[PDB]
Design a protein around this nucleic acid. Structure first.
Ligand SMILES: [K+]
Ligand SMILES: [K+]
Ligand SMILES: [Mg+2]
Ligand SMILES: [Mg+2]
Ligand SMILES: [Mg+2]
Ligand SMILES: [Mg+2]
Ligand SMILES: [Mg+2]
Ligand SMILES: [Mg+2]
Ligand SMILES: [Mg+2]
Ligand SMILES: [Mg+2]
Ligand SMILES: [Mg+2]
Ligand SMILES: [Mg+2]
Ligand SMILES: [Mg+2]
Length: 235
RNA sequence: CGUCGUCAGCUCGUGCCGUGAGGUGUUGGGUUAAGUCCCGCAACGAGCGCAACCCCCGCCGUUAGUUGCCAGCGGUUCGG
């Protein structure tokens, strides 16, 4: 909530190509063939976006975090592992929202296998199943790591790159789900309901935005939490 | 009942794409006897198939000696 001047490394967009003309309103200028985001409109939209986040958080709503860009996976896997908003980390499975019932059946199988590895029934039905179900539970935890928390459809989604995660955006639009996204120059701003015009490639931009967002979430429900242990993920 | 053919296939549920017949999944890369499995993927699962569970032959044991052996000894018309 105090990220006015601390925006170090967010204004750097993508190159001259691979952009989207609809983003021109959020662009300041072009330095050395690289689009640079307008600093003013960034906080201009941040006001409205963080205000919507605070409103939805103090109401007890759930926000799905979607990150697959390989530069925000390790960040989302813990910023959502904070206050219980679920997340999608490895890859976004087609139908996680429009076919939510079938994915919830997969989650039922996940907790079923977790219960079988808690009961003494691990030894019966010998080692063949003890390896098959082991690998099955392994991949179910790999893909449904954060998704297992969604009991019903979420009240909003948070995307790190709406171009890389366009399928999730489309599925949210189909179900009238508000779409919060950290957009860059390579994305269509019209599809995003609450835009955050920043950088999606750098690690510091994602860490800053998501840390401040989860901090605002916990602040909307009281009990301000310590600074997130995501700085060590700079490496 | 024969046959394609023990061939590796044929479909469904939900989602998604297309005005629609339909497509996706079942395509792809690796792999196997196999739609076998792995990885990837707007798909996620499932059914009938594949394989497995059944029978026979291969090694060993337990249980039991009207089948078997001077394995072990005695008798022997010396033929367990
Ligand atoms: K068309
Ligand atoms: K193949
Ligand atoms: Mg065959
Ligand atoms: Mg179908
Ligand atoms: Mg057509
Ligand atoms: Mg249609
Ligand atoms: Mg079909
Ligand atoms: Mg087909
Ligand atoms: Mg095809
Ligand atoms: Mg199969
Ligand atoms: Mg596939
Ligand atoms: Mg007899
Ligand atoms: Mg006998």
């Amino acid at each position: 909530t105090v990220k006015e001047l601390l925006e170090a490394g967010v204004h750097f967009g993508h190159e001259r190509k691979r952009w989207n003309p609809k983003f021109a309103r959020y662009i300041y200028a072009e330095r050395n063939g690289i689009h640079i985001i307008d600093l003013q409109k960034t906080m201009e939209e941040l006001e409205r976006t963080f205000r919507f986040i605070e409103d939805l958080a103090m109401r007890g709503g759930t926000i799905l975090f979607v990150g697959t860009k390989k530069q925000a996976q390790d960040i989302v896997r813990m910023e959502a592992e904070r206050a219980g908003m679920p997340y999608v980390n490895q890859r976004w499975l087609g139908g996680m929202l429009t076919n939510f019932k079938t994915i919830s059946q997969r989650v039922h199988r996940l907790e079923e296998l977790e219960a079988l590895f808690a009961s003494p029934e691990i030894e019966e039905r010998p080692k063949k199943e003890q390896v098959r179900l082991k690998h099955e539970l392994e991949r179910l935890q790999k893909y449904l790591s954060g998704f297992r928390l969604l009991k019903r459809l979420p009240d909003a989604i948070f995307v790190v790159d709406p171009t890389k995660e366009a399928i999730a955006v489309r599925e949210a639009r189909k179900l009238f789900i508000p779409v919060i996204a950290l957009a860059d120059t390579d994305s269509d701003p019209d599809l995003v309901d609450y835009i955050i015009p920043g950088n999606d490639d750098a690690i510091r931009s994602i860490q800053l935005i998501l840390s401040r967002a989860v901090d605002l979430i916990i602040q909307a429900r009281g009990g301000v939490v310590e600074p997130s242990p995501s700085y060590a993920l700079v490496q």
